[PDB]
């Protein structure tokens, strides 16, 4: 008698949107916006460095909390909220630029710059930097007058980069907590530090006086840096209030640097990271963290965008 | 839908059809039977899979940190970064929504189309031996047994065989 | 249009139809009448309203001043801002144009489709009692008074009632 | 006899574009690109501040034109073309960054920093800053030697922020119009100003000499600033050529800052502003001003993009 | 395609049709002939040309150098530029791909549609004097010479002229 | 008997992609992503300047390699890889900002600033800047003490911009290769240079000492600049180590600046340029160079995106 044409259906359909209609029901649909976060740093197949208490910039100068990371190799570098670059208080000039460089460095290797000293002490120390006792930055030399209030001779030290890669060169300017302390460490009179290379030139003077205490100290050591090209030479000329580099840093290769609160997990594999962990997904979009880095879905504002994978559902 | 088959001249779907997406429901002397159409089902599935294939295809573009959650960067650059990021987020949110809306409209329309294309194929097959009910059914004038019905489904029904009696049975 | 109804097999529109978007124009013994079809008119309107609903939906993303019209900002950042702004303006101008073109193509096509769907519904209703003119008209073989015509419009026309005389009137 | 299917039409149709055709006529269409500007700042339901002659940065230091805005509260801040930050000529360091901060501040409140002075005058004044007569910045103290050419004693002043929000701290370096004027105001010899906090350190020296006259003056006062964290302490140490803060500023909440030529109108409500007024619209796009701020349609280059709201028009 | 004409009920194309995009292939007493349909061919061509017209339309937005290949700019701004540029490149790559995919789907569908619209026009013309084969052919009951065939192509075929014999030749 | 409906086809169809299918064959298609590069700078109908050995910043100060470009007019400015701004080694402060200004300047015209000198020599020279013999920057004056180790009198020079356009003002600070050389050129004692205008103020001191040799020299001359508003006055005050401007630069109009390795070709016309030549295209997209400038297609990552210009091809 009769033959009829039809299509499948289900009672439990899924809502989607179209250009023409909001919440039309279809037989099946898939989510295109990732909401699933893994609360771990998934590091399977990656050489990681978990810096912990060591601030990334600290690796170059070596406060005690960075003693285990003075030379490190990694393709994933994790900065932690407790990380601190310094021990004796102070700051790095142009600090975020240097962080960006170090994050993608593949790690660092160190080489002695060959400076030796006569007519001054080399063993400046502080309770702010503790090892067995009062100590200092492992990669640096706190230069002082031979005796309290003694004359600090005008000095000049030069280092030529004889490698085929740029050398990261760090130095410090010490702002004493008082004029009396400055005169004691370095002798009385005006202190001037000049630094140049073929293309860099800058002069520095300490402004001594009491800052609020950090790590027990009212002085400050501010760090400056340059990338010294192959065959270029950096020259330091100073009469005190100068924190000299002992070693230069060289970059090792390539890496991704992340900031995270999440625990390492060597068992899961991932490419997209953020403060709260790893986004593992094949979806084109994500609504977890707009600042995620690595290889990530694109951040969108919407919670959900359902892609129809079936016909209109007509029960 | 643009073709008015699904949720149109076909009043509703069959929840019992668990074997495919489109199918045949027949009535003859020997009773009732329901069977899935493979080709139409596969055409729709493959089209939708092609859409999925396109959407889950990842880009290999890396991004690096441009600012810092532990120690705020300088505000001059910070403000530009934030303005740029917010602008890009707006662009992608717009792009995503528009993509999914267009894809979904077309997915509904292609599925509706596929239903229509199967209905039409059958109508052309039953040249003059049957006419359109209007709820997606063909009232066959001549008597058509299970093997005759299978001949429609397997796409080998001979119109001129049953012509005589069908047209007489106007 | 994709369906070839509007500006296709239907030669032109009726400026006199001020009651709806789609309608019926009939001729019988008692003369001529024109009436609007509610369902088809409402389907098209609601589809278009859905498009408007989507487009007038504002985002709540704030933007702040990044540069200054009274005192020019530093040029290093200024040049980046300008480059970024020009790039974003290009993106949005492209997005807007593409959106409106796609929406407009589909709006014309869905309206054409709706016309086609109504025509087809009528054809299936008039099973064998009428045939297609070709300018969107159905020549009814049997005589069909105002109440018979209303039966077509209200979608309750009984084909098998007038079958006999219509087919005889081949 | 016959039943015919058809559709409506009109003689006066509207042109639109599609992917396939330019200028196809449809029964109805709506514009998606806003061109309608309201030549007012629509401020209904908002606390506004119309700065007028007062430059936004002026609010922090208080030239006479800002006397009425030394402490202000607003959620919409309007900068005007006639606005001037200064009276005695000079400039703010990092001025646009500070403007961005103040624009979204919700306004400012002031608190005395508690500095008192002995051995110097406090009442430096100039015809460039006029109230009843020659005057100065209301929030600042122009410190001078007790007598013409007198000794200016080496001084140090410190302020600890004991609030739970950061304090905006401003100070000035005075560049005299000549060496003779410098020696007269402050006594002869080198002038040095040093400013530090826990994380900030900078030293300043005046370069005296004649600049082109502005507001009758050939000297300059350049203003520097910092945001002082809760419990941090700013220290000023100086021997002259120093413009001291009397009060610190604190931010009040949240606001939008705009620049506009348009007249205030408390009767209309709006969220999107620019130099020429307010864009009031539900359309997704606008072609009025690419630099509009607040909650705005997206700027596009095109004058018009008509969205079809009907079928093809066939008369 | 959505209409199931091209690569559907029409099994394949004619490589011999070098005169147009769509055409007629006839068989009568006097033999075989193939001719192009101008209007349908022109409709498709003009639609596609409209797409090309839209895509080759250049923007007059200038861009200037923001960084330097001979001497690297400062890294703070450099990193922001690179991040912004990479983000914009992702946006445009996405935009381009989506545009071309949508345009291509619709181009295939409009060409399929145009084929369908021509087939349907012919069917309505041959009111009752012929019926649908199913491979896009019309089996004409009455005899139809070269001039009768040309009457179909030039769109002036009179159905009621040959009605009698055709329907008799059921 | 029969009439059949059909469509054209070809054996050699072209693959395209759709939303639903990858590599569907169509009768015809066109490429939307430009891959064709012209390995030339197509300059038909444009006034070009090919800087060659002359660095763009060099045009303002005039090392010997820039003698032919001291005043130039162009609407297309081409920087070359061999370009060098300097002869005596050193660098421009804020160098890329100045390059961006000069690239779009339309070229420059020069005007004498009217400085004349008594009590000092004006004819400082170096083998690093060679013309017939040792020479210097054509637009600058190397001021020296009248005799070796002689007193350099404290001097002040002022220039008012009396044009209706801003004046580009350049000056240099000379860092001698040693203290002994500084004392010889300029006399012993501290050297200080101060520069101000109505809105600009800065002080400079040389740090003498040996840099690595460039062009035979261990000293450095670092160049600073400002844009001097109409009716503003720049003042230089100095006692040596000062490289004075002889002429100011004024911008001429509008131009596009490019960096290119490609040879000029006055026969082809073009609007989009990059390191490797000219992109001549009507296509909306290009995959040649993401940093192309002028009027260009948009850069995309993909090699090819074929736009279908025909029906599905069914042989
Ligand atoms: C309440 C308050 O503000 N008190 C400060 C004192 O803190 C400050 O004295 C400094 O206090 C430190 C711990 O709080 C510590 O004892 C400082 O002594 C040392 C140090 O360990 O850092 C002792 C070292 O022997 C000395 N090293 C050398 O001289 C060379 O190796 C260092 C060094 O002098 C400083 O670190 C350089 O700033 O100091 C102690 O100085 C006191 C003086 O500033 O002022 C009080 O108001
Ligand atoms: C044509 C030209 O360039 N002329 C300048 C003079 O303008 C300049 O003298 C200054 O002229 C001012 C008005 O043009 C004004 O009279 C300056 O006097 C005052 C002032 O009101 O600013 C007088 C104040 O009593 C004095 N205040 C104090 O000393 C302490 O309260 C101030 C103060 O000395 C200066 O503002 C600091 O720069 O000056 C008058 O100095 C003249 C000297 O520079 O040089 C001519 O060439
Ligand atoms: C191996 C090494 O490092 N050697 C350096 C010497 O290079 C350097 O001496 C300088 O060497 C130059 C060529 O290498 C050149 O001979 C310098 O002499 C001139 C010059 O032409 O530049 C001679 C000019 O007469 C003199 N001009 C004037 O005094 C005023 O017009 C200039 C001028 O003194 C300098 O350019 C300023 O820096 O120098 C020659 O000085 C040597 C001294 O620095 O140190 C060796 O170690
Ligand atoms: C640029 O945008 C970022 C957001 O990506 C802004 O950083 C955010 O700043 C807010 C306000 O300072 C932070 O929220 C605050 O957190 C503190 C401590 O948890 C709390 O005391 C406040 O009540 C408030 O919750 C927010 O954490 C921070 N977000 C991130 C990711 O760092 C930044 O301020 C913007 N920069 C500029 C210059 O406007
Ligand atoms: C970044 O882009 C902005 C535009 O948003 C540029 O600002 C514009 O600069 C031009 C030229 O200086 C200004 O036009 C000029 O106006 C003055 C005075 O009205 C007149 O003398 C000139 O004839 C010309 O008309 C324009 O007003 C200004 N626009 C805005 C909104 O400020 C800016 O220069 C660009 N920045 C960089 C670093 O390139
Ligand atoms: C921002 O992005 C640009 C790319 O547009 C980066 O510039 C590129 O840097 C790389 C690595 O330094 C250059 O490649 C290298 O070239 C040198 C010499 O030819 C060679 O020694 C290396 O083996 C490597 O091939 C690349 O040429 C350069 N590209 C351009 C167009 O300049 C830049 O580093 C990025 N900036 C920041 C701050 O990350
Ligand atoms: C650095 O100098 C040495 C000197 O012989 C040379 O072998 C080397 O190639 C130079 N390297 C560069 C990068 O200029
Ligand atoms: C600041 O110091 C006081 C000292 O008792 C303390 O009560 C307050 O919580 C501190 N605030 C912050 C923000 O560290
Ligand atoms: C500059 O000063 C002169 C002085 O008479 C005046 O004619 C000219 O208009 C002024 N120009 C500007 C731009 O202020």
Residue numbers in the entry:
A (entry chain A), D (entry chain A), F (entry chain A): 11 to 141, 143 to 158, 158A, 158B, 159 to 263, 265 to 276, 276A, 277 to 324
B (entry chain B), C (entry chain B), E (entry chain B): 1 to 170
Reproduce the article's own wording on this structure.
To elucidate the molecular determinants for NeuGc binding, we determined the crystal structure of the HA of A/Equine/New York/49/73 H7N7 in complex with its receptor analog 3′-GcLN (NeuGcα2-3Galβ1-4GlcNAc). The electron density for the ligand 3′-GcLN could be fitted well for all three monosaccharides. H7eq binds 3′-GcLN mainly through NeuGc-1, but the interactions extend over the 220-loop with hydrogen bonds between Gal-2 and the main-chain carbonyl oxygen of G225 and between GlcNAc-3 and the side chain of Q222. The NeuGc-Gal bond of 3′-GcLN in the H7eq complex adopts a cis conformation, which is consistent with our previous findings for the structure of 3′-GcLN in complex with the A/Vietnam/1203/2004 H5N1 Y161A mutant that shifts receptor specificity from NeuAc to NeuGc. In the H7eq 3′-GcLN structure, the 1-hydroxyl group of NeuGc-1 forms a hydrogen bond with the main-chain nitrogen of E135 and the E135 side chain makes a salt bridge with R144. In the complex structure of H7eq with 3′-GcLN, R193 forms a hydrogen bond with NeuGc-1. The overall RBS structures of H7eq and A/Turkey/Italy/214845/02 H7N3 were shown to be similar. Despite these similarities in RBS structures, we found that H7tu bound solely to α2,3-linked NeuAc on the glycan array, whereas H7eq bound exclusively to α2,3-linked NeuGc. The WT H7eq HA was previously shown to bind NeuGc on the glycan array, and here we showed that this WT HA also specifically bound horse erythrocytes and tracheal epithelium. After the introduction of the five reciprocal mutations (T128S, V130I, E135A, A189T, R189K), the equine HA still seemed specific for NeuGc on the glycan array but started to bind to chicken erythrocytes and tracheal epithelium, while binding to equine tracheal epithelium was decreased.
